């Protein structure tokens, strides 16, 4: 994707003999890191880190719905809470690779 096929050949005679030297290292494009890879058990702890780090009691029990509940209802309102991270958004966009058993 980042460098598709079909390029002009890298003719040696040109690369050397030229006075108007142009070559694979004459002019170049910069690059911010594409698609790095993680080891699974680091992906896992990235996740499990952001979870606890973002969990925020007040932000699930907004007032004025709060300030009226019994304690038991309040605790069971809060005793489960998912989250959906979509890594392909991160920078770099962590690709995910492994074996399936």
């Amino acid at each position: 994707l980042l460098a598709p096929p079909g390029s002009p050949v890298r003719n040696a005679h040109n690369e050397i003999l030229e006075e108007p030297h142009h070559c694979p290292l004459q002019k170049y494009t910069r690059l911010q890191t594409p698609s790095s890879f993680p080891t699974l058990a680091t992906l896992k702890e990235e996740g499990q880190r952001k979870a606890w780090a973002s969990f925020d009691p007040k932000a699930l029990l907004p007032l004025p719905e709060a300030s009226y509940l019994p304690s038991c209802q309040l605790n069971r309102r809060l005793a489960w809470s998912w989250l959906c991270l979509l890594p392909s958004a991160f920078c770099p966009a962590q690709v995910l690779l492994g074996v399936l058993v």
Binding site: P70, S71, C72, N75
Partner: protein, 80 residues
């Protein structure tokens, strides 16, 4: 822990407390002798009546609609 059927269980009305203040209540008794069929028999937990009683409690707990209990919510720890 087992299941019983109390054949010809007597019911009887109560209306007082130990200090003889009023309180309406229900008594239950089983008079001596088997006449009329007063008795008990252990029920096997393979009996379809026991399946019916189990079925009933399935609603009496999940769909209980009953107030709180086990306020000590730090107690269960599930399969600790």
């Amino acid at each position: 822990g087992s299941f019983l059927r109390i054949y010809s269980l007597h019911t009887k009305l109560q209306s007082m407390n130990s200090e003889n203040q009023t309180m309406l209540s229900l008594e239950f008794h089983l008079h001596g002798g088997t006449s009329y069929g007063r008795g008990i028999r252990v029920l096997p937990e393979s009996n379809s009546d026991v399946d019916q009683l189990k079925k009933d409690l399935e609603s009496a707990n999940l769909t209980a609609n009953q107030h709180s209990d086990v306020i000590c919510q730090s107690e269960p720890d599930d399969s600790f």
